[PDB]
PDB file of C-alpha atoms and ligand atoms in Angstrom:
ATOM      1  CA  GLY A   1      33.320  59.548-244.373  1.00 15.89           C
ATOM      2  CA  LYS A   2      32.089  62.809-242.854  1.00 15.68           C
ATOM      3  CA  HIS A   3      29.049  63.163-240.588  1.00 12.98           C
ATOM      4  CA  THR A   4      27.121  66.389-240.944  1.00 14.57           C
ATOM      5  CA  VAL A   5      25.107  67.719-237.996  1.00 12.17           C
ATOM      6  CA  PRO A   6      22.693  70.626-238.471  1.00 15.30           C
ATOM      7  CA  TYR A   7      22.775  73.152-235.658  1.00 14.27           C
ATOM      8  CA  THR A   8      20.937  76.333-234.759  1.00 14.01           C
ATOM      9  CA  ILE A   9      21.783  79.181-232.411  1.00 16.78           C
ATOM     10  CA  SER A  10      19.274  81.056-230.273  1.00 18.66           C
ATOM     11  CA  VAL A  11      20.384  84.031-228.175  1.00 18.04           C
ATOM     12  CA  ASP A  12      17.873  86.056-226.159  1.00 16.52           C
ATOM     13  CA  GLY A  13      15.034  84.437-228.099  1.00 13.40           C
ATOM     14  CA  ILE A  14      16.429  85.226-231.558  1.00  9.16           C
ATOM     15  CA  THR A  15      18.035  83.201-234.389  1.00 11.63           C
ATOM     16  CA  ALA A  16      20.157  84.490-237.280  1.00 13.29           C
ATOM     17  CA  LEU A  17      21.939  82.367-239.897  1.00 11.78           C
ATOM     18  CA  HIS A  18      20.161  79.350-241.395  1.00 12.45           C
ATOM     19  CA  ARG A  19      21.219  75.894-242.549  1.00 11.94           C
ATOM     20  CA  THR A  20      24.526  75.692-240.740  1.00 12.26           C
ATOM     21  CA  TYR A  21      26.201  72.341-240.022  1.00 13.04           C
ATOM     22  CA  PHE A  22      29.000  70.870-237.926  1.00 15.18           C
ATOM     23  CA  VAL A  23      31.112  68.128-239.528  1.00 17.81           C
ATOM     24  CA  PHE A  24      32.586  65.103-237.751  1.00 14.71           C
ATOM     25  CA  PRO A  25      34.565  62.164-239.106  1.00 14.96           C
ATOM     26  CA  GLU A  26      32.252  59.122-239.201  1.00 13.61           C
ATOM     27  CA  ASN A  27      32.150  56.717-236.251  1.00  9.61           C
ATOM     28  CA  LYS A  28      35.142  58.203-234.445  1.00 10.05           C
ATOM     29  CA  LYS A  29      34.397  58.913-230.779  1.00 12.25           C
ATOM     30  CA  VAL A  30      35.056  62.416-229.452  1.00 11.74           C
ATOM     31  CA  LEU A  31      34.973  63.928-225.971  1.00  8.85           C
ATOM     32  CA  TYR A  32      32.081  66.294-225.300  1.00  8.27           C
ATOM     33  CA  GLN A  33      34.714  68.991-224.784  1.00  8.88           C
ATOM     34  CA  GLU A  34      35.288  68.890-228.545  1.00  9.50           C
ATOM     35  CA  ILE A  35      31.604  69.521-229.273  1.00  8.93           C
ATOM     36  CA  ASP A  36      31.618  72.214-226.567  1.00  8.67           C
ATOM     37  CA  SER A  37      34.490  73.876-228.429  1.00  6.47           C
ATOM     38  CA  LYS A  38      32.760  73.889-231.811  1.00  8.73           C
ATOM     39  CA  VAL A  39      29.651  75.311-230.145  1.00  5.88           C
ATOM     40  CA  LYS A  40      31.430  78.128-228.308  1.00  8.90           C
ATOM     41  CA  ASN A  41      33.333  78.876-231.512  1.00 10.71           C
ATOM     42  CA  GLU A  42      30.159  79.550-233.462  1.00 12.80           C
ATOM     43  CA  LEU A  43      28.432  81.393-230.634  1.00 12.81           C
ATOM     44  CA  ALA A  44      31.377  83.785-230.703  1.00 10.65           C
ATOM     45  CA  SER A  45      31.813  84.178-234.459  1.00  6.92           C
ATOM     46  CA  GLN A  46      28.114  84.388-235.361  1.00  6.78           C
ATOM     47  CA  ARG A  47      26.584  86.066-232.314  1.00  7.10           C
ATOM     48  CA  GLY A  48      29.573  87.619-230.600  1.00  7.29           C
ATOM     49  CA  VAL A  49      28.868  85.467-227.547  1.00  5.96           C
ATOM     50  CA  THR A  50      32.247  84.891-225.918  1.00  8.06           C
ATOM     51  CA  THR A  51      33.187  82.587-223.058  1.00  4.29           C
ATOM     52  CA  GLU A  52      32.869  85.540-220.726  1.00  5.92           C
ATOM     53  CA  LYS A  53      29.360  86.163-222.073  1.00  6.54           C
ATOM     54  CA  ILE A  54      28.396  82.529-221.456  1.00  6.76           C
ATOM     55  CA  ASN A  55      29.535  82.538-217.831  1.00  7.60           C
ATOM     56  CA  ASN A  56      27.401  85.627-217.152  1.00  7.57           C
ATOM     57  CA  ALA A  57      24.263  84.418-218.939  1.00  8.54           C
ATOM     58  CA  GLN A  58      21.215  83.152-217.060  1.00  6.24           C
ATOM     59  CA  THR A  59      21.284  79.942-219.082  1.00  7.39           C
ATOM     60  CA  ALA A  60      23.639  78.615-221.762  1.00  9.23           C
ATOM     61  CA  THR A  61      23.206  75.118-223.142  1.00  9.66           C
ATOM     62  CA  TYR A  62      23.027  73.000-226.260  1.00 10.67           C
ATOM     63  CA  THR A  63      20.649  70.110-226.750  1.00 11.28           C
ATOM     64  CA  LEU A  64      21.665  67.050-228.706  1.00 11.77           C
ATOM     65  CA  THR A  65      18.926  65.105-230.429  1.00 14.72           C
ATOM     66  CA  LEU A  66      20.238  61.622-231.171  1.00 13.83           C
ATOM     67  CA  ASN A  67      19.254  59.441-234.111  1.00 11.91           C
ATOM     68  CA  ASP A  68      17.042  57.274-231.916  1.00 10.93           C
ATOM     69  CA  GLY A  69      15.010  60.315-230.945  1.00  8.21           C
ATOM     70  CA  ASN A  70      16.384  60.756-227.420  1.00  7.11           C
ATOM     71  CA  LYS A  71      17.947  63.996-226.239  1.00  7.11           C
ATOM     72  CA  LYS A  72      20.818  65.061-223.999  1.00  5.50           C
ATOM     73  CA  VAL A  73      21.335  68.578-222.654  1.00  5.21           C
ATOM     74  CA  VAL A  74      24.841  69.922-222.031  1.00  6.80           C
ATOM     75  CA  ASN A  75      25.463  72.972-219.824  1.00  8.37           C
ATOM     76  CA  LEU A  76      27.984  75.325-221.470  1.00  8.88           C
ATOM     77  CA  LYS A  77      28.833  77.148-218.222  1.00 16.29           C
ATOM     78  CA  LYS A  78      30.117  73.959-216.587  1.00 17.57           C
ATOM     79  CA  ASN A  79      30.029  70.629-218.406  1.00 17.20           C
ATOM     80  CA  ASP A  80      30.652  67.747-215.997  1.00 20.95           C
ATOM     81  CA  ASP A  81      30.324  65.354-218.945  1.00 23.88           C
ATOM     82  CA  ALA A  82      33.165  67.252-220.631  1.00 24.97           C
ATOM     83  CA  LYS A  83      35.174  64.090-220.103  1.00 23.13           C
ATOM     84  CA  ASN A  84      32.531  61.598-221.272  1.00 21.60           C
ATOM     85  CA  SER A  85      32.680  60.473-224.894  1.00 24.02           C
ATOM     86  CA  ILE A  86      30.137  60.108-227.645  1.00 24.98           C
ATOM     87  CA  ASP A  87      29.961  58.842-231.211  1.00 24.77           C
ATOM     88  CA  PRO A  88      29.142  61.968-233.226  1.00 25.39           C
ATOM     89  CA  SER A  89      27.505  59.724-235.830  1.00 24.79           C
ATOM     90  CA  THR A  90      24.665  59.209-233.346  1.00 28.79           C
ATOM     91  CA  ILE A  91      23.906  62.942-233.327  1.00 28.99           C
ATOM     92  CA  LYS A  92      21.031  64.109-235.542  1.00 31.09           C
ATOM     93  CA  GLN A  93      20.809  67.774-234.576  1.00 32.85           C
ATOM     94  CA  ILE A  94      22.075  70.390-232.121  1.00 32.67           C
ATOM     95  CA  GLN A  95      20.053  73.262-230.657  1.00 34.35           C
ATOM     96  CA  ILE A  96      22.143  75.963-228.983  1.00 36.63           C
ATOM     97  CA  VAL A  97      20.331  78.242-226.529  1.00 34.45           C
ATOM     98  CA  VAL A  98      21.606  81.187-224.519  1.00 35.50           C
ATOM     99  CA  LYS A  99      19.624  83.701-222.472  1.00 35.82           C
TER     100      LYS A  99
HETATM  101 ZN1   ZN B   1      26.742  60.331-240.928  1.00 38.19          ZN
HETATM  102 ZN1   ZN B   2      20.700  56.274-227.690  1.00 37.84          ZN
END
């Protein structure tokens, strides 16, 4: 019913909280913008990394590792694929990185 996706946050080479997960309703497609939103939300609440902080960072991205082992990197500063859709059920893990 609910798809859990473990995620980690790295900022300036450091990581804080452990075993944190995003939750998505099973097999219901979402726009990447929705995942972008959940990601920015946590960056802000857990690391105090606001939208303004993302825009001024050298690099700000999140890497999706899909169930089949492949990966897809999304740029948080400007996500062209913000319109594209994806089945969250295909996502195994998310690695958020900002520097
Ligand atoms: Zn699932
Ligand atoms: Zn695939």
